[PDB]
Structure 1
Amino acid sequence: SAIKPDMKIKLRMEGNVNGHHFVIDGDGTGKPFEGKQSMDLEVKEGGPLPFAFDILTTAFNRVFAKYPDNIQDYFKQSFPKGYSWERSLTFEDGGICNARNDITMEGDTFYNKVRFYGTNFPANGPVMQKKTLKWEPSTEKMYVRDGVLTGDVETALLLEGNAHYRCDFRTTYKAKEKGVKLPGAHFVDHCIEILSHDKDYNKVKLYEHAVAHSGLP
């Protein structure tokens, strides 16, 4: 195994949402075999962000997911060369974004080069008015579409006042190394949470737990 039980995380995100430019750095640690990661995020440019921080958080690595023996782990088999992903997020009110991550490994550390581009968010909407509270727990459906490992998520952000704001993500995952075998179809359950934050979300502690399963208990 190239992957150790405790792995460091380094991350830089550059992005623009509705015109607004920003740069965010990440430093964290994770347990790839237990499916747990936590990281400290700091806005370096463009703060304070004029949109809900929550729309970024799923962009801040499926190597952090507990995979049972009976599912092929495409992500851990991708290292040390690594893998990339591209994601489209489609929100119920027309907001649309495109995120990508290129993930590499050096020694005990995953490096993440993240880009995040959002547009078409209504000025009066919960993202530009900062009304989001959290992502609900979600299930990612993994399958192969025309030779490419694909994950679909139908999810929602909880808003102030007992309302939900619906999100559909599609992610495509590609190993750098030709001939990493594609897995069979499966599920990954996700729980993502902001553990702490400062006044305008310039500093955020982020936690994710993920578990791969075949649908049964």
Structure 2
Amino acid sequence: AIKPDMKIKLRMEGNVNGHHFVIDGDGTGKPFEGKQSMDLEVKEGGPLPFAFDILTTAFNRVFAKYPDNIQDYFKQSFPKGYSWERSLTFEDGGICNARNDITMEGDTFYNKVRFYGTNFPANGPVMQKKTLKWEPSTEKMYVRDGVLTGDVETALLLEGNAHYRCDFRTTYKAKEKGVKLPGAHFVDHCIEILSHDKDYNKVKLYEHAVAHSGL
């Protein structure tokens, strides 16, 4: 069902601290290598009055290198596809809820992303655009009450030698009942903005992910 080379199409609608936006994306990826890259364009609501870095994890764990000895819930979820819901809890009270419904049509993944942020202090690094990047992290994958859950404790690097900490919890659901849940495992991941324009209206985003058993 999943080819070595797949295309990505995206539309995100969202609101952060009452600021509405629409962002489209177009990319490609190698699902078996665990690599994806995409071109994002802000279509409505630009220039965004907050840190683009808070959105970038919302922009598909199908693009993760799974070893033979871990059940790949994401590749086995196609062709019908899967959804996730995610909460982002920042150390200064900032909260985001994001969701993605992922479908496949031929060689293309379609992504319907919704992203809601609130409670970002006006004086903080998100609304003042002081963020520099996400630090690489390990996602803890396990089952909670019959649902595949993933946790991440990570941080944004800020200007001036500081980190801004964020906890992610993500729930994953296949559309097909019957897709067996995997055992617990880890996903190492790195996400980078490769290029941007002045106000992050156009952004090239890269993500690489590798699943492992912690050895």
Give TM-score, length-normalised by structure 2.
1.00
Residue 107 of structure 1: how far off its partner (Å): 0.2
Query: 1:198 Cα shift?
Result: 0.2
CA deviations over 1:52-87 (Å, ceiling 9, x no partner): 000000000000000000000000000000000000
Deviation at 1:102? 0.1
Helix, strand or coil at the partner of 1:77: helix
How far off its partner does 1:168 sit? 0.1
Secondary structure of 1:47 counterpart? coil
Deviation at 1:50, TM superposition (A): 0.1
SS in 1 for 2:97: strand
Cα deviation digits, residues 154-204 of structure 1 (max 9, x gap): 000000001000000000000000000000000000000000000000000
Tell me the SS of whatever aligns to 1:89: strand
Structure 1 residue 108 displacement after superposition? 0.2
Where 1:128 maps in the other structure, the secondary structure is coil
Secondary structure of the residue aligned to 1:153 is strand
How far 1:25 moved relative to its partner? Answer: 0.1
Does residue 171 of structure 1 match 2:170?
yes
Offset of residue 17 of structure 1: 0.0
**Which residue number in structure 1 is paired with residue 214 of structure 2?**
215
CA offsets, 1:3-32, max 9 Å, x none? 000000000000000000000000000000
What is the DSSP-based 3-state SS (H/G/I as helix, E as strand, rest coil) of the residue aligned with 2:33?
Answer: coil
Deviation at 1:36, TM superposition (A): 0.1
Q: RMSD in angstroms over aligned alpha carbons?
A: 0.2
Hey, what's the Cα distance between the residues in 2 that align with 1:97 and 1:200? 21
**C-alpha distance in 2 between matches for 1:20 and 1:108:** 34
Paired with 2:25 and 2:175, the residues of 1 have a C-alpha distance of 23
Give the Cα–Cα distance (whole angstroms) in 2 for the partners of residues 201 and 96 of structure 1: 22
Aligned residues: 215
Q: Which residue of 2 aligns with 1:120?
A: 119
Counterparts of 1:19-168 in structure 2, within 5 Å, are 19-168=18-167
> Quick one: distance in 1 between partners of 2:33 and 2:160?
35
Shift of 1:97: 0.6
Q: Deviations over 1:98-136 (max 9, x none)?
A: 000000000000000000000000000000000000000
Structure 1 residue 92: Cα displacement: 0.2
Task: Find the residue that maps to 2:177 and give its secondary structure.
Answer: coil
Mapped partners of 1:181, 1:114: distance in 2 = 25
TM, length-normalised to structure 1: 0.99
1:133-152 deviations in Å (ceiling 9; x for gaps): 00000100000000000000
Percent identity of the aligned residues? 100
In 2, Cα distance between the equivalents of 1:127 and 1:212? 30
Residue aligned with 1:178, SS: coil
Gaps of 5+ in 1: none
Give me the whole-angstrom Cα distance separating, in 2, the residues matched to 1:121 and 1:191: 25
